[PDB]
Each structure stands twice: as structure tokens, then as C-alpha cells.
Design a protein around this ligand. Structure first.
Ligand SMILES: *CCC(=O)NCc1ccc2cnn(C)c2c1
Length: 346
């Protein structure tokens, strides 16, 4: 077997000539020549079986990505693993090879308004499909948006995804949360478990803002600082939006703050298209009930050049996990990962 930077990368015979791309939360990722389809592919090595939350995240990614089929969602082309549970220590996920991701692109490249528009359209087109399956991505951010050399965009990393559950979204103030801080909606810190579709729209708003300036709009340094940043731009919530937060700890925290006025988007983003800023405003609405939904966003004038609901497909059915994954021991989750990956064995 080939090794890559002091690590077995055990994918042959089918996949050879491994060129390391980089490490991450996604383990070691390499490109490799696929000797059957005669193209280079991406392959990511996952070693989750010791840690139960690693197993949960791995199983979610696999189950979701295998069920979904959409141009703006990364597919799984193949999964390589040992023929038996006893011998399975790693899983390799094979996907279409992408040139970059939006995190890397924003570090290095100014985006034209046409590119921002097209990227935003593709993110929302993919999100329409995900939400139509009653799934929440819950960790949308630049590093989870992959792009090929022709700027086709694909959403990746469904490791924190959940089925939507609005009736059980309410929680107390300062409840701990897992998804990436800079892209978290204000309500996460106040009264929300992130079980509604509005959570993803906030992240997309943050991504739009970041495309406009190449800098994160709300770069918080810790849990409550994130809310400081959001209120620093949106200004103090209205009485009506405050009255929607029934929880007294969360309500009174907001009431304790000095009055802050809204920073106009056109002063933060003087070069931005005015239609882009009108849509941005609607995605970065404080009150999640008044926040724009994905299908409304697609229909917004900013996206008129691309909008075509007949070519923005939805999922054939709602998604459901077989059972809750949070209570399952890792030995059941290893067996589930083994079963979910069986279709790729010869
Ligand atoms: C969702 C984020 C992720 O999986 N990133 C890893 C990755 C890096 C490079 C690359 C090229 N083609 N694909 C697919 C990837 C994935």
C-alpha cells in the first residue's frame, strides 16, 4: 500500500499516484488517479471507530450524502473499507475532485459581483434541496463549500446535520453549541437549539457578507462575543423581536445592553450591488421567524439572472435516521457504518 506523509493510504488497486492535498477535521485528503473512470478523484481517510461522536458524525455524513443527489451537493462516488467489521479500522470516502473551497478562495482572491451572485445562487439551490428533505446542514461556512475549476459549487460536510424539529427548538440562555462560531445565528446564544431551517439561512447570510469583503462579518472570539459582534452591526433588537424571546435570562441580557444603532450595509459594503445588500439584510434578520426562507431567497431580484424553480430540484422524500444516533454506543455505530458502506464492496 502507498503511504503519504507518515500515514498508510490504502486505496489500491483502483486508486493510485496519491498526491496529498491537506489534513483537517476530514482527516487526510489526497487526490488519486481512478483507474476505472480514468480521472483524478478526491479521497478522504476517516479513522473514527474509537470515539463515539466521530462515529455519529461519520455515519450522518455517509447516510445523508448517499441518499442525496444534487448538482450543488458533493456526492460519494465510492467508499473503501476492509471486508469485515473486525478488520475495518479506517474508511476512505471517494468524491469528485474539486480545485478549491470558498475559505481558500476568499483568503487569496477578490470575487467579482458576477461570481458572488453565481456562488450565492448555487449555495441556495443546494440548500433548497437539503431543506426540502427536512434536513438542516447546521455548519455552513466557506470551508464547506467546494468549487471546481469552472466555479461549480458543492456543499460538503453533513457531519453536524439534523432532521428539522421546530417544536423542540427552545432552550435557555447560553446553551452550549457545536457548530462554527462565526456563522451562528444570534438565537443560538439566546434561546435556540438550531433545529429550524432559519439557522442555515443565517450562515448563508454570513457567507454572502464574507464574499463581499473577504473578511468574516462577525468574527467573535468566544461564545457570548459572537452575539456582541452581531448586535454591533444589526443594532439593538426592536421591542417586538425582544417580546418573541420569552426566556427571562435571555430577555434581560438584551435589555441590559446600551442602545446600539444599525450600521447600514451600504457603509460596510460600499462596493456591493444594492440588490445583494437587500438580500443580505433579509438573511441577517435578527428574528428567525421574519428571516427569509431558502425559496424566497432564490426568488429575490439579486438572483433574477439564474432563478428558475423548475431547475431547482427538491428531494423525492423527507429524510429520517433509522434511530437516534446520540444514544447508540460506538459498537452499534461501527456496525451501522459497515452496513451503510456495503453497496461499494464487489
Ligand atoms: C466539506 C469539506 C471537505 O471535505 N474538505 C476536504 C476536501 C479537500 C479538497 C478536495 C478536493 N476535492 N474534494 C472533494 C475535496 C475535499
Amino acid at each position: 500500500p502507498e503511504m503519504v506523509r507518515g500515514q498508510v493510504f490504502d486505496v489500491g488497486p483502483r486508486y493510485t499516484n496519491l498526491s496529498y492535498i491537506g489534513e483537517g477535521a476530514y482527516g487526510m485528503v489526497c487526490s488519486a488517479y481512478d483507474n476505472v473512470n480514468k480521472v483524478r478523484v478526491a479521497i478522504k481517510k476517516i479513522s473514527p471507530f474509537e470515539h463515539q461522536t466521530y462515529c455519529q458524525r461519520t455515519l450522518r455524513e455517509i447516510k445523508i450524502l448517499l441518499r442525496f443527489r444534487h448538482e450543488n451537493i458533493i456526492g460519494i462516488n465510492d467508499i473503501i473499507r476492509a471486508p469485515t467489521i473486525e478488520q475495518m479500522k479506517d474508511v476512505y470516502i471517494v468524491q469528485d475532485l474539486m480545485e478549491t473551497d470558498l475559505y481558500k478562495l476568499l483568503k487569496t482572491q477578490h470575487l467579482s459581483n458576477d461570481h458572488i451572485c453565481y456562488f450565492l445562487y448555487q449555495i441556495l439551490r443546494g440548500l433548497k434541496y437539503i431543506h426540502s428533505a427536512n434536513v438542516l446542514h447546521r455548519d455552513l461556512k466557506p470551508s464547506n463549500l467546494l468549487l471546481n475549476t469552472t466555479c461549480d459549487l458543492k456543499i460538503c460536510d453533513f457531519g453536524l446535520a439534523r432532521v428539522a424539529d421546530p417544536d423542540h427548538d427552545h432552550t435557555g440562555f447560553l446553551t452550549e453549541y457545536v457548530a462554527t462560531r462565526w456563522y451562528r445565528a444570534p438565537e443560538i446564544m439566546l434561546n435556540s437549539k438550531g433545529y429550524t431551517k432559519s439557522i442555515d439561512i443565517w450562515s448563508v447570510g454570513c457567507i454572502l457578507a464574507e464574499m463581499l469583503s473577504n473578511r468574516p462579518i462577525f468574527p467573535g472570539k468566544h461564545y457570548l462575543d459572537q452575539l456582541n459582534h452581531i448586535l454591533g452591526i444589526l443594532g439593538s433588537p426592536s421591542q417586538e423581536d425582544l417580546n418573541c424571546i420569552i426566556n427571562l435570562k435571555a430577555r434581560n441580557y438584551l435589555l441590559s445592553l446600551p442602545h446600539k444603532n444599525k450600521v447600514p450595509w451600504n457603509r460596510l459594503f460600499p462596493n456591493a450591488d444594492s440588490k445583494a445588500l437587500d438580500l443580505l439584510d433579509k438573511m441577517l434578520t435578527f428574528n428567525p421567524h421574519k428571516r427569509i426562507e431558502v425559496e424566497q431567497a432564490l426568488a429575490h431580484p439579486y438572483l433574477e439572472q439564474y432563478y428558475d424553480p423548475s431547475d431547482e430540484p427538491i428531494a423525492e422524500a423527507p429524510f429520517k435516521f433509522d434511530m437516534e444516533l446520540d444514544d447508540l454506543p460506538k459498537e452499534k455505530l461501527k456496525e451501522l457504518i459497515f452496513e451503510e458502506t456495503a453497496r461499494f464492496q464487489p
